[PDB]
């Protein structure tokens, strides 16, 4: 059986370069391909970038328990979520699976698939994360204040996760995740 790992973290502790490292380091890693009810953009491939389905199908899948998690996107412009079947079929074939989702999606997946390992990718310190949120200072005080507030709420509940990987350095955070996946 392949391990299923669910990778989450703060709304912006930066996860896309970590994900890219992982897919580079594990040759046959299955990166979960989400279902969505929005339209393809040019260059998006059905089955690779998303499984493109229609609102009616999506509701059918919700009703039959075929989603590990789903959410309304942009206040309900459309819907996205993680399909259960590809994840289970890949693991049964022996391929390792990575699901990358926001904290609400990680929380939902632990209920629908308890044997998934949940990983919270933590910053090496508060000041490290705060520096990154202030960034180039091109946002207003109110926006920055909201980001810092959001970040502390999210940080406060990393305890709910099976594992905390501290992102001290790309290579060792990536190494820790490889060890979990294979
Ligand atoms: N809950 C959930 N949200 C997703 C999923 N896939 C993408 N999203 C959310 O919707 C996305 C919008 O990205 P886009 O539509 O530009 O690919 C991101 O904000 C992402 O957090 C998913 O599988 N489940």
Swiss-Prot record:
Catalytic activity line of the entry: GMP + ATP = GDP + ADP
Domain Guanylate kinase-like: 2-182
Family matches, as SUPFAM superfamilies: P-loop containing nucleoside triphosphate hydrolases
Transmembrane parts of this sequence: none
EC number: 2.7.4.8
Signal peptide residues on this chain, from the entry's feature table: none
Top-rank taxon, per record: Bacteria
CDD domains, per the entry: GMPK (cd00071)
Database matches in InterPro entries: GK/Ca_channel_bsu, Guanylate_kin-like_dom, Guanylate_kinase, Guanylate_kinase_CS, P-loop_NTPase
UniProt main location, coarse: cytoplasm
Entry GO CC: cytosol
UniProt keyword Kinase present: yes
Known function: Essential for recycling GMP and indirectly, cGMP.
Protein's name in the database: Guanylate kinase
UniProt source species: Mycobacterium tuberculosis (strain CDC 1551 / Oshkosh)
Taxon lineage: Bacteria, Bacillati, Actinomycetota, Actinomycetes, Mycobacteriales
